[PDB]
Scaffold this active site. Structure first.
Site, PDB file in Angstrom:
ATOM      1  N   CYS A  25      65.476 -26.603  95.784  1.00  0.00           N
ATOM      2  CA  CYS A  25      64.225 -25.608  96.009  1.00  0.00           C
ATOM      3  C   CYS A  25      64.806 -24.944  95.566  1.00  0.00           C
ATOM      4  O   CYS A  25      63.841 -24.030  95.111  1.00  0.00           O
ATOM      5  CB  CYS A  25      64.061 -25.335  97.203  1.00  0.00           C
ATOM      6  N   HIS A  30      65.413 -23.533 103.101  1.00  0.00           N
ATOM      7  CA  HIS A  30      64.174 -24.024 101.970  1.00  0.00           C
ATOM      8  C   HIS A  30      63.990 -22.780 101.267  1.00  0.00           C
ATOM      9  O   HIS A  30      63.955 -21.525 102.199  1.00  0.00           O
ATOM     10  CB  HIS A  30      63.486 -24.464 102.493  1.00  0.00           C
TER      11      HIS A  30
END
Length: 367
Positions: free
Chosen positions: A16, A315
């Site tokens: 990510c 993330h």
């Protein structure tokens, strides 16, 4: 019915950092265009780089990824690009899935590769030049002025006192026989694209471990940096800003199938947007450098966020402003794409374990 959602990248497991970074870069119009039109026959600008061939392959693989985003391939898997990046920059091949990485580090290395391939055509759109004043704290007749420092981003320093991005940007411009010298930067040239780094990641002394500053730091949708400029340059940029504001205000005053009507309206909206761009452009200063911001004002176009304890956990996501509708934002949660409103963006200032802004991209007012 007719409007298609932008597409995202599938997360391969802790990738990510790459996905969020690619969405932010794709949003930068000039960069997107030069990548989409890259022909390997054109070589590179800096063939002094010993690893020239791999930088070119990075660009080639970015172009393939960008072609898949532009032409909405419901999901893009950046496998070959990741492999290529890892060959060039082995830091990104660290394991423990591959290890999560600092998006800032990726951003920096991608900038390096794009500078090698495209040269000034790329880098001039991001360059910030400084006038640096160096004074002996012990003697205020010992003064030296330098004009040759530059960078491609500004750092927003965050401590316990920091509540607004401006606070941290100002702190970032200053630093400190032998003596202590104050070194004070003011901006003498602004870029058309202004990247701001929130300094959130740090090495904790107490734990000998990577950590993260969670503090809420409010950023603006419309950034004005006149107070960071040299007096001479501010005078120039404020004059431009005041003419552009006049255009903005005047702007705010003012048998086909259903598919055909939608496509006609898109064409109409693009034409109207282009006519306003031309109106702003009438007021750009005569000796503007390629890649230079006409004024001292920017609009926010993208935000890379992070949620997690440090740069090797959690993330990353991207929030991207729509290119026509300035009130509309897209959330790219890897391949899960959604529309969000301005309030959601404001909430990214942070505080606690919430997803929060890490890198902000601004584009010059009237562009």
């Amino acid at each position: 019915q007719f409007a298609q959602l932008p597409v995202g990248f599938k997360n391969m497991g802790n990738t990510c950092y790459l996905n969020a970074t690619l969405q932010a870069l794709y949003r930068v119009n000039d960069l997107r265009d030069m990548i989409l039109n890259y022909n390997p026959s054109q070589g590179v600008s800096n063939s002094g780089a010993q690893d020239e061939e791999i930088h070119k392959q990075i660009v080639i693989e970015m172009k393939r990824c960008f072609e898949n985003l532009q032409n909405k391939f419901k999901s893009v898997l950046p496998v070959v690009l990741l492999n290529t990046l890892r060959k060039c920059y082995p830091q990104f091949a660290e394991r423990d899935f591959y290890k999560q990485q600092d998006a800032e580090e990726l951003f920096t290395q991608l900038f390096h590769s794009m500078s090698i391939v495209f040269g000034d055509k790329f880098s001039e759109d991001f360059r910030i030049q400084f006038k640096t004043t160096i004074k002996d704290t012990a003697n205020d007749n010992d003064i030296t002025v330098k004009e040759n420092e530059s960078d491609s981003k500004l750092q927003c320093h965050i401590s316990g006192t920091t509540n607004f991005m401006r606070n941290g940007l100002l702190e970032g411009l200053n630093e400190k026989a032998n003596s202590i010298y104050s070194v004070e930067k003011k901006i003498s040239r602004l870029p058309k694209f202004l990247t701001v780094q929130y300094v959130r990641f740090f090495w904790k002394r107490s734990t000998n471990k990577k950590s993260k500053i969670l503090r809420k730091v409010v950023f603006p949708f419309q950034l004005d940096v006149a107070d960071m400029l040299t007096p001479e340059y501010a005078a120039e940029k404020v004059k431009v800003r005041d003419e552009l504001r006049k255009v903005e205000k005047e702007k705010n005053e003012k048998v086909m199938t259903p598919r055909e009507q939608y496509e006609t309206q898109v064409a109409l909206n693009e034409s109207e947007k282009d006519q306003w761009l031309e109106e702003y452009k009438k007021h750009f200063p005569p000796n503007l450098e390629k890649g230079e911001n006409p004024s001292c004002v920017y609009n926010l176009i993208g935000v890379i966020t992070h949620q997690g304890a440090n740069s090797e956990s959690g993330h990353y996501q991207a929030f991207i402003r729509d290119e026509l509708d300035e009130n509309k934002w897209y959330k790219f949660n890897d391949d899960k794409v959604s529309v969000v409103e301005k309030e959601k963006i404001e909430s990214l200032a942070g505080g606690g374990e919430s997803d929060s802004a890490l890198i902000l991209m601004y584009k010059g007012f009237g562009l």
